[PDB]
C-alpha cells in the first residue's frame, strides 16, 4: 500500500480499485481519475468505504472522513470532512490520457495510438493493462471435446454451448488435458500435438498466463558518448563485414541504436558481424519468436566459435529449437534466447531482432532481465507487427507498433541497410516505392520470372477465413505450363486458402505472417480477397519480398495489382 503516483511520481498510499492493475495515484490525480471516469473505488491499507453496518457506499465522492473511519452522508458524524475535497482525495503526503488508458477496452486502434504517444510510465501502465485485459478475456471462449480420432494428424471436434468458439490457427494455441500444448487447423480438424501422445476421445483449453508487473522502461534513456565505450574494437575484421564498420562504431558511441533493415538487406549479417568487430564482448541475441532466434543461431554457426554459444530453451518446450549449440548454458559469451525465456543477467551488447513483432511489454521485459552497456534494436517497421487479438476497429499504423518503431518512423532510424540482395529487381522496385520512399536499391537484375494476374475469382468463407478456389485453379493451369515452379511455396493471407491449396496443388504452404524472415526461390501468392487484411501494405511487402528468383501474384485488388512492376499473364 506504499507507492508513488503513476502520473507525477508523488508518493502516496491511494490505489484505484477499479483499474485492473490497481495503480498508485497521488491525492491530486486520484481526484481526476474518480471525478472524470466511472472509477470511484479508492484503495489504501483500508478500503475507502462507509464503515457503517449494512452500507454499500463505495463512491469516494460520496464518502467523508469522520474521526478515523470513513462514512457516507447518511452515517457521517457532525464533524466530518469530505474525502474528495479541494481537488484532492484524502491521503498521505497531501490525466486525461491516463483516464482513457484506464477506461478503454483495447478494441479500437486509438487505444493503441495513445498507449504509444503517452509518457513512459503511462506506456508501461497501458502495456500491463492491455496484457491483463487480453488474459482476463482469453477465458471466455468455448472448450473443445474430441468427437472421434481419425488419424494421428486429424480429429473430429465438438464445441461447448454458450461460449464463442476460438479460431483454428496456430496463433490460437491450446493446452491439452496435461497432454501438452496443441494447435488446430480447420469438417475434420487437423491437430498438432507438441508430443506424440495418441489423442483419444473424451479428451479436452486456450493457453493463458499471469500478467506479471513491469518496472523497466521500454527504452532506456539515450546516452551519446564521445568514443566507443565499454567495447574493444578489432583491427582485422573480415572484408565480408567491412561495410558495417562505420555502423559498428555508432553502436559503441551510443546507449541504444536503431537499424531499419528491409528484406534481404543483411540484418542477421550485421548482427553476427557485430561480434566479430567486438570479439571479447558478451552478446545476448534475443527476439520474441523462436524462429528468429533460430535464424540468428544458424547465422552464428558459420562465423562464431561453436563453443562460446548457447541456445536457451524454455522448460515448457513447444516448437523444436536449434539443436547445434549448448542448450541452457547462460555462461557462454553468445546467448541466443527468446524474450520470455530471458535470464536475469548482464552483457556488453544486447541485440533485439524482429523489432516490428515486439510489444512494449516485450521491450520492458528486456530492459529489465538484461542490464547492458549497449542495446541494438534491429527490424523494419514496413513489415508485420505482433497480432493484437483485441483490436477489431481500425488499423494500427507502423509508428504505433512499439516505441522503437515510433522512433524509426518519426525521427528516423540510426542505420538503414539500403541494398536488397535477395529479390529480383522487379520486386525490389515495387516495394521500394510502396513503403520505402524509393530508398531501397536492388543488387540483382530483373529476373523476368515475376508475373502478375488480376482475377477476382469467387470468395467462400470457412467461418471467417477466406478461400478463393478459382484463384487456386488459375495456379493449377499455370503449374502445368511452368514446370520449374513445381517447387514453389504457396503463400496467402488466409490459413483456409492455404489448406485448400495444399490439397489441390500439393505445394508447401505458408501464411504471409508466418513467412516473415523466410526466403524461397519461387513463390506463388493469391490475394484471395479484397480486404484491409489482404491489402495491408506491410503484409503485401513481406509476401512478395520472400522470392529470390520468381513470383506469381494472383491479384484481387486493382491498386496493388497496378503497382506490381511485373509482366502480366493472361488466362
Binding positions are: 5, 8, 16, 19, 26, 29, 33, 39, 50, 55, 72, 75, 261-268
Q: How far is the CB of 389 from Zn ion (least distance, A)?
A: 23
Where in 205-234 is the site for Zn ion (CB under 5 A)?
none
Nearest Cα to Cα of residue 181 among 164, 199, 166, 200? 199
Which member of 18, 85, 391, 433 binds Zn ion (CB under 5 A)? 18
Nearest Cα to Cα of residue 288 among 352, 220, 367? 352
Which member of 8, 92, 327, 463 binds Zn ion (CB under 5 A)? 8
Lateral strand order in the sheet of 24-25: 24-25, 14-16, 42-43
CB burial of residue 429 (10 Å; 0-12, 13-18, 19+): buried
Question: Secondary structure of 97-137 in the HEC alphabet?
Answer: HHHHHHHCCCCEHHHHHHHHHCCHHHHHHHHHHHHHHHHHH
E strands, 404-444, where?
A: 415-416, 419-420, 441-442
Does 39 contact Zn ion by CB under 5 A?
Answer: yes
Q: How far is the CB of 27 from Zn ion (least distance, A)?
A: 8
By beta-carbon proximity to Zn ion, the closer residue of 18 and 216 is 18
Does 75 contact Zn ion by CB under 5 A?
Answer: yes
Does 19 contact Zn ion by CB under 5 A?
Answer: yes
By beta-carbon proximity to Zn ion, the closer residue of 52 and 118 is 52
By beta-carbon proximity to Zn ion, the closer residue of 18 and 253 is 18
By beta-carbon proximity to Zn ion, the closer residue of 7 and 560 is 7
Does 76 contact Zn ion by CB under 5 A?
Answer: no
Does 104 contact Zn ion by CB under 5 A?
Answer: no
* Interacting span for Zn ion (CB under 5 A) from 15-23, 165-173, 253-261, 482-490: 15-23
Where in 148-207 is the site for Zn ion (CB under 5 A)?
none
Task: Determine what percent of the chain falls in helix, strand and coil, rounding each to the nearest 5.
Answer: 30, 25, 45
Does 5 contact Zn ion by CB under 5 A?
Answer: yes
Which member of 27, 49, 50, 363 binds Zn ion (CB under 5 A)? 50
Does 29 contact Zn ion by CB under 5 A?
Answer: yes
Q: How far is the CB of 31 from Zn ion (least distance, A)?
A: 10
Nearest Cα to Cα of residue 503 among 470, 472, 477? 472
What is the C-alpha separation between 298 and 306, in angstroms, rounded? 11
Residue ranges of the binding site for a ribonucleoside 5'-triphosphate: 261-268
By beta-carbon proximity to Zn ion, the closer residue of 19 and 355 is 19
Does 7 contact Zn ion by CB under 5 A?
Answer: yes
Alpha-helix residue ranges (DSSP H) falling in 44-108: 96-103
DSSP string, 470-538: HHHHHHHHHHTT-GGGTTPEEEES-HHHHHHHHHHH---EEEHHHHTT--EEEEEEE--S-SHHHH-HH
CB neighbours (10 Å) of residue 471? Answer: 26
Instruction: Give the angle 143-146-150 at the CA atoms, nearest 5°.
Output: 150
Which member of 13, 14, 26, 257 binds Zn ion (CB under 5 A)? 26
Which member of 11, 36, 55, 160 binds Zn ion (CB under 5 A)? 55
Q: How far is the CB of 75 from Zn ion (least distance, A)?
A: 4
What is the C-alpha separation between 402 and 217, in angstroms, rounded? 12
C-alpha 526 chain-centroid distance: 25
Nearest Cα to Cα of residue 29 among 115, 95, 118? 95
Helix, strand, or coil here: 564?
coil
Does 42 contact Zn ion by CB under 5 A?
Answer: no
Which member of 102, 428, 479, 505 binds Zn ion (CB under 5 A)? 102
C-alpha cell at 225: 558518448
C-alpha 528 chain-centroid distance: 25
Helix, strand, or coil here: 561?
helix
Which member of 72, 408, 505, 553 binds Zn ion (CB under 5 A)? 72
Where in 378-437 is the site for Zn ion (CB under 5 A)?
none
By beta-carbon proximity to Zn ion, the closer residue of 87 and 164 is 87
Count interface residues toward Zn ion (CB under 5 A). 16
Does 52 contact Zn ion by CB under 5 A?
Answer: yes
Backbone angles phi, psi at 129, to 5 degrees: -60, -50
Does 21 contact Zn ion by CB under 5 A?
Answer: no
Mention every residue, 6+ apart, whose C-beta is less than 8 A from residue 500: 467, 469, 472
Task: Please report, for residues 29, 97, 546, the alpha-carbon distance to residue 21 in angstroms, rounded to integers and kept in the order given.
Answer: 16, 16, 41
Residue ranges of the binding site for Zn(2+): 5, 8, 16, 19, 26, 29, 33, 39, 50, 55, 72, 75
Q: How far is the CB of 4 from Zn ion (least distance, A)?
A: 8
What does the per-residue mask of binding to Zn ion show for 520-549, with x meaning CB under 5 A? ------------------------------
By beta-carbon proximity to Zn ion, the closer residue of 136 and 346 is 136
Which residues contribute to the site for Zn ion (CB under 5 A)? 5, 7-8, 16, 18-19, 26, 29, 39, 50, 52, 55, 57, 72, 75, 102
Amino acid at each position: 500500500a506504499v507507492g508513488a503516483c503513476v502520473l507525477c511520481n508523488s508518493q502516496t498510499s491511494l490505489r484505484c480499485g477499479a483499474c485492473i492493475r490497481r495503480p498508485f495515484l497521488c491525492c491530486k490525480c486520484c481526484y481526476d481519475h474518480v471525478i472524470s471516469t466511472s472509477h470511484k473505488l479508492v484503495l489504501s491499507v483500508n478500503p475507502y468505504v462507509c464503515n457503517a453496518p449494512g452500507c454499500d457506499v463505495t463512491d469516494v465522492t460520496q464518502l467523508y472522513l469522520g474521526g478515523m473511519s470513513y462514512y457516507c452522508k447518511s452515517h457521517k458524524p457532525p464533524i466530518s470532512f469530505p474525502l474528495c475535497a479541494n481537488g484532492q482525495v484524502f491521503g498521505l503526503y497531501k490525466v486525461t490520457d491516463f483516464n482513457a488508458i484506464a477506461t478503454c477496452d483495447w478494441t479500437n486502434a486509438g487505444d493503441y495510438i495513445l498507449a504509444n504517444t503517452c509518457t513512459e510510465r503511462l506506456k508501461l501502465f497501458a502495456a500491463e493493462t492491455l496484457k491483463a485485459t487480453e488474459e482476463t478475456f482469453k477465458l471466455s471462449y468455448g472448450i473443445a471435446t474430441v468427437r472421434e480420432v481419425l488419424s494421428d494428424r486429424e480429429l473430429h471436434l465438438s464445441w461447448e454451448v454458450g461460449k464463442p468458439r476460438p479460431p483454428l490457427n496456430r496463433n490460437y494455441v491450446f493446452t491439452g488435458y496435461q497432454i501438452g500444448e496443441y494447435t488446430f487447423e480447420k469438417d475434420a480438424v487437423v491437430y498438432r500435438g507438441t508430443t506424440t501422445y495418441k489423442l483419444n476421445v473424451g479428451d479436452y483449453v486456450l493457453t493463458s498466463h499471469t500478467v506479471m508487473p513491469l518496472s523497466a522502461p521500454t527504452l532506456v534513456p539515450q546516452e551519446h558518448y564521445v568514443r566507443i565505450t565499454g567495447l574493444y574494437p578489432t583491427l582485422n575484421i573480415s572484408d565480408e563485414f567491412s561495410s558495417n564498420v562505420a555502423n559498428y562504431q555508432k553502436v559503441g558511441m551510443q546507449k541504444y541504436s536503431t537499424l531499419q533493415g528491409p528484406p534481404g538487406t543483411g540484418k542477421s549479417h550485421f548482427a553476427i558481424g557485430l561480434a566479430l568487430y567486438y570479439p571479447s564482448a558478451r552478446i545476448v541475441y534475443t527476439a520474441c519468436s523462436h524462429a528468429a532466434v533460430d535464424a540468428l543461431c544458424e547465422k552464428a554457426l558459420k562465423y562464431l566459435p561453436i563453443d562460446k554459444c548457447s541456445r536457451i530453451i524454455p522448460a515448457r518446450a513447444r516448437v523444436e529449437c536449434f539443436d547445434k549449440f549448448k542448450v541452457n548454458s547462460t555462461l557462454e559469451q553468445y546467448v541466443f534466447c527468446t524474450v520470455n525465456a530471458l535470464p536475469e543477467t548482464t552483457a556488453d551488447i544486447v541485440v533485439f531482432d524482429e523489432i516490428s513483432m515486439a510489444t512494449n511489454y516485450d521491450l520492458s521485459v528486456v530492459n529489465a532481465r538484461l542490464r547492458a552497456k549497449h542495446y541494438v534494436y534491429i527490424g523494419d517497421p514496413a513489415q508485420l507487427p505482433a497480432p493484437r487479438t483485441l483490436l477489431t476497429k481500425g488499423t494500427l499504423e507502423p509508428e504505433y507498433f512499439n516505441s522503437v518503431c515510433r522512433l524509426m518512423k518519426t525521427i528516423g532510424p540510426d542505420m538503414f541497410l539500403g541494398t536488397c540482395r535477395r529479390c529480383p529487381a522487379e520486386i525490389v522496385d515495387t516495394v521500394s516505392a510502396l513503403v520505402y520512399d524509393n530508398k531501397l536499391k536492388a543488387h540483382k537484375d530483373k529476373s523476368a520470372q515475376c508475373f502478375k494476374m488480376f482475377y477476382k475469382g469467387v470468395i467462400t468463407h470457412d467461418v471467417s477465413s477466406a478461400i478463393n478456389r478459382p484463384q487456386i485453379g488459375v495456379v493449377r493451369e499455370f503449374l502445368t505450363r511452368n514446370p520449374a515452379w513445381r517447387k514453389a511455396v504457396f503463400i496467402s493471407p488466409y490459413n483456409s486458402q492455404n489448406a485448400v491449396a495444399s490439397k489441390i496443388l500439393g505445394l508447401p504452404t505458408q501464411t504471409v505472417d508466418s513467412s516473415q524472415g523466410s526466403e524461397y526461390d519461387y513463390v506463388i501468392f493469391t490475394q484471395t480477397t479484397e480486404t484491409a487484411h489482404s491489402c495491408n501494405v506491410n503484409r503485401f511487402n513481406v509476401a512478395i519480398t520472400r522470392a529470390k528468383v520468381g513470383i506469381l501474384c494472383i491479384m484481387s485488388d486493382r491498386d496493388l495489382y497496378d503497382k506490381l512492376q511485373f509482366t502480366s499473364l493472361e488466362i
